Design a protein around this ligand. Sequence first.
Ligand SMILES: Nc1ncnc2c1ncn2[C@@H]1O[C@H](COP(=O)(O)OP(=O)(O)O)[C@@H](O)[C@H]1O
Ligand code: BEF
Ligand SMILES: [Mg+2]
Ligand SMILES: [Mg+2]
Length: 508
Amino acid sequence: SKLIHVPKEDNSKEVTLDSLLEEGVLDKEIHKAITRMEFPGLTPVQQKTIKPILSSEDHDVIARAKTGTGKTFAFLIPIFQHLINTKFDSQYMVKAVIVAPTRDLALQIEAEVKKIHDMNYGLKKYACVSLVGGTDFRAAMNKMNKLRPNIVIATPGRLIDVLEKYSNKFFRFVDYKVLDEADRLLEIGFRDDLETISGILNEKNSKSADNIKTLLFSATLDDKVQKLANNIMNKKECLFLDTVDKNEPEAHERIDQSVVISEKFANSIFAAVEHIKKQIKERDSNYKAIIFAPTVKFTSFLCSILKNEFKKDLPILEFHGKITQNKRTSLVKRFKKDESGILVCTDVGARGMDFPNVHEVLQIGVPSELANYIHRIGRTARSGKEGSSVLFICKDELPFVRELEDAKNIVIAKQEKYEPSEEIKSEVLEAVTEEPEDISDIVISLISSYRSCIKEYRFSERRILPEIASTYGVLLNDPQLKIPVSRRFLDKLGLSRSPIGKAMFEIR
RNA sequence: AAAAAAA
Ligand SMILES: Nc1ncnc2c1ncn2[C@@H]1O[C@H](COP(=O)(O)OP(=O)(O)O)[C@@H](O)[C@H]1O
Ligand code: BEF
Ligand SMILES: [Mg+2]
Ligand SMILES: [Mg+2]
């Protein structure tokens, strides 16, 4: 398909809700909804995205815009507009399907649709239903039958379940499908699912197999995604709406980035505790921050430490895929409202999630993928607000930082070293309740995690893996100790032959 | 054992 580029214009023409109203692009009902939100004016992506989406319905849309710049409304406003000027057709059928890589992001997008509804009750006739895992399947279908939504927000897994069973009933008249965080949804582990989704929607469409128009949105994507999505893009042409220069870094420039480099991985923990401590003092507990960790078990562990240290000063929230979905939703809306607190989470919260006025984004270790560094720090400095970010890593993780410059052109100017005092180590380690068996599982989970991204971040396996494993000895206050495992376990890991295995483990 | 995703 023909991929048409539309680079970031220098000055360009101003676009406004009023202008789109007078121009005939937008109806008064949707115009009334967004105006009441009292935004200063449409964001760059929104100005560059709305009219093209409503344009000649023989083209697809790819849109790149930095984090926190209102990409959600950039495709929700047009969708609503499409629904208005087709209100006398199909009516009780899904006309827009929005897909997100995490449940909480899908539920967030739903909430944003509900905000549009609350600003104009006239738009409530265009109902919306979310379809995500961890929710009652029957209840969602009853909601489907009752509301007969024109908009569906979903995660790939639950959506396929519904489509396999009810495609004929609701999805024979889809006109739009949206891939939010598109690049992620087009990666291995999601790509096959979205191809399954796209195929079913096309096969079931009443007009034609190429009727559906596809919208791709993310803060991180290139031309590679257009190739990765070639099977889900129906139209013959495709617009690339980019509000970012080719050479410009995808990371938000307003974020004050820094990296704290330590000798070991374990004392990135100590550095972060000292940083948070310093931050709570200076800000007088007026501190809202998100700290990312590489692993669920380590996240839960890091959470346990931060409670013992800072629960007296701030709420500490634990957020990952092993948290029950009810609790995930509960803490997400709390941290959205709260003025302060520390959200401790995995990369489940790396993309899309919009928490107003986060002061800082902290990172212990590396993200699950290179791009997610951009999305991680993107949780702060949103909607014009300021923000800072700190990356806590060890010496053996520097290749990730270098790769960050080589690939994404992200240069972290502020760099500093760190060595923990004996007092801090005693303070933190004295406040661990975990048995040696628990510490083992935690470090093992980190070994598995770091082993899987050796190639991505150009890590030296002979160096990084022993360092991660050595965390076990540090936490038990005995650097000489190795992780106790069985011969079968060491074999299951496949390092029975590798010298690195012996350096990490002790066969008991 | 390892981040998401019908779990
Ligand atoms: N036109 C606008 N002007 C000011 N703020 C906006 C505008 N559009 C959206 N926002 C704000 O941006 C926040 C998050 O936007 P979001 O859709 O998450 O952007 P992205 O998806 O690109 O990260 C929302 O809380 C919203 O209040
Ligand atoms: F890119 Be945004 F944060 F969804
Ligand atoms: Mg978004
Ligand atoms: Mg924020």
